[PDB]
Ligand binder design. Sequence first.
Ligand SMILES: *[C@@H]1O[C@H](CO)[C@@H](O)[C@H](O)[C@H]1NC(C)=O
Ligand SMILES: *[C@@H]1O[C@H](CO)[C@@H](O)[C@H](O)[C@H]1NC(C)=O
Ligand SMILES: *[C@@H]1O[C@H](CO)[C@@H](O)[C@H](O)[C@H]1NC(C)=O
Length: 190
Amino acid sequence: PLTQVNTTVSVQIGTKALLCCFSIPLTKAVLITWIIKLRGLPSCTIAYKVDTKTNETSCLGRNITWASTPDHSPELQISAVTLQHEGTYTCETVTPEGNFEKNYDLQVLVPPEVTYFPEKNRSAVCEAMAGKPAAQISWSPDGDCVTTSESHSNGTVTVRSTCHWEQNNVSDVSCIVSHLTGNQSLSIEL
Ligand SMILES: *[C@@H]1O[C@H](CO)[C@@H](O)[C@H](O)[C@H]1NC(C)=O
Ligand SMILES: *[C@@H]1O[C@H](CO)[C@@H](O)[C@H](O)[C@H]1NC(C)=O
Ligand SMILES: *[C@@H]1O[C@H](CO)[C@@H](O)[C@H](O)[C@H]1NC(C)=O
């Protein structure tokens, strides 16, 4: 293309995603094509040829459509984002004077499954399972901890924190989970 824009987009699982075809509206478009390359699947397209008003789709059963709009804007829509929607979304606009391309690296935000519990010998476990990206785990009060981060095949990350407190005056502890989808302070009785 004569101008290529590459960007990353993060959208929360289950939400609706709207992607603009280019950084600016392009008036003299003769052809608009979205090429969707999903993780482990053949590519499909949604296209619009301007002169004949010929709309196209080879994305049946992929839940990817043009956005519904009165002015027929070349915006792509994902009505309910699944982890499977991760991939490259490329919009190609042909104008008489040149090609414009916008490539989206679409990333899905996944709230972690949080489990927390006391363990034997004044210990506590706090785990943020299969979050995307990794959650962060901190504690109140600070303890002697071992925290691991395990990434899975799906791209989600399990963060597991196991602590012990050598201050016998401490009876209640709080696990603080931070994530792009949400944050929470979680109490544990030792
Ligand atoms: C932009 O993204 C495309 C598709 O993901 C890639 O092929 C291309 O190399 C990237 N451009 C640059 C300048 O890195
Ligand atoms: C293609 O058709 C859909 C409805 O099936 C419409 O929402 C969309 O605007 C059309 N595409 C373009 C760019 O006109
Ligand atoms: C991978 O992702 C799914 C969500 O799509 C999650 O529920 C699951 O726990 C993850 N897989 C493993 C083996 O952890």
